[PDB]
Amino acid sequence: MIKTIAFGRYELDTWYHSPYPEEYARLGRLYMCEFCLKYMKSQTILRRHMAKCVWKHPPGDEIYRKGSISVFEVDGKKNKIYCQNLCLLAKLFLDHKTLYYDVEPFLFYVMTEADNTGCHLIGYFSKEKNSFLNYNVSCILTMPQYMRQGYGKMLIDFSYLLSKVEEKVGSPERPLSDLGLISYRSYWKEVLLRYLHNFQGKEISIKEISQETAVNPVDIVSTLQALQMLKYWKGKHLVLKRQDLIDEWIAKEAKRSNSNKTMDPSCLKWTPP
Amino acid sequence: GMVEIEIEGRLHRISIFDPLEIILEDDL
Ligand SMILES: [Zn+2]
Secondary structure (H helix, E strand, O other): OOOEEEEOOEEEEOOOOOOOOHHHHOOOEEEEOOOOOOEEOOHHHHHHHHHHOOOOOOOOEEEEEEOOEEEEEEEOOOOHHHHHHHHHHHHOOOOOOOOOOOOOOEEEEEEEEEEOOEEEEEEEEEEEOOOOOOEEEOOEEEOHHHOOOOHHHHHHHHHHHHHHHOOOOEEEOOOOOOOHHHHHHHHHHHHHHHHHHHOOOOEEOHHHHHHHHOEOHHHHHHHHHHOOOEEEEOOEEEEEOOHHHHHHHHHHHHHHHHOOOOOOHHHEOOOOO | OEEEEEOOOOEEEEEOOOOEEEEOOOOO
């Protein structure tokens, strides 16, 4: 079975099992075209491909660019093959991912970092074209060579930015991988502490916050309690503005945004359906 | 809209449309 993939300049241990054709699943190493995501039997095979291959980035529309960092929006129906490969790729490293074959009812948002060779795959999230439950994220992944660098947050943040511009509230698809429950929990804290920092009024409804940030009202109540800011005295429900967390949030703001790991609504060029 | 969960060994239910009061420190 498979254990490692050659992905661009990287050599990655694979974490799970992916339903690759047994012809390939018989192999312990797969060589992936870093731009079109074709999988190949050997190094010699790949090299010849790379000499033919034309992709220097994914397909679809580049709906966000801020310098080297882009995000492409790929239609599962418009690039069925690119998206299917993407899933197989993501199925290593993602434990509970369902879909591989039928990528048509989905949009894929592919984040990439550009250098002199091309636009390299950072990570992606998929999004149903018509989520019955209003999920703004189906599956989300940071490539291993980009983990613990604040790109997960950027992906999540972009998923809600779409939701905002769509004028919707949404939430990731349940269930939530053990690794992704921590990052959303984290992200919903950034988001909420910021709001309370900017909000100068004396009262607010969840629906207001839900509408400003695009975070689902349940995920808001959840985080408020996680932060222990939902208090009940004298017969009603009060929001408790913790100075500490808010003050820690501002110091943490300096740190993060010194390293430019922030998405930027000014750079998005998108229209929703 | 009505959410439910726990605050210090009690059980509590809260609407997502009522304005909730924001406070700092104070007597409670
Ligand atoms: Zn290729």
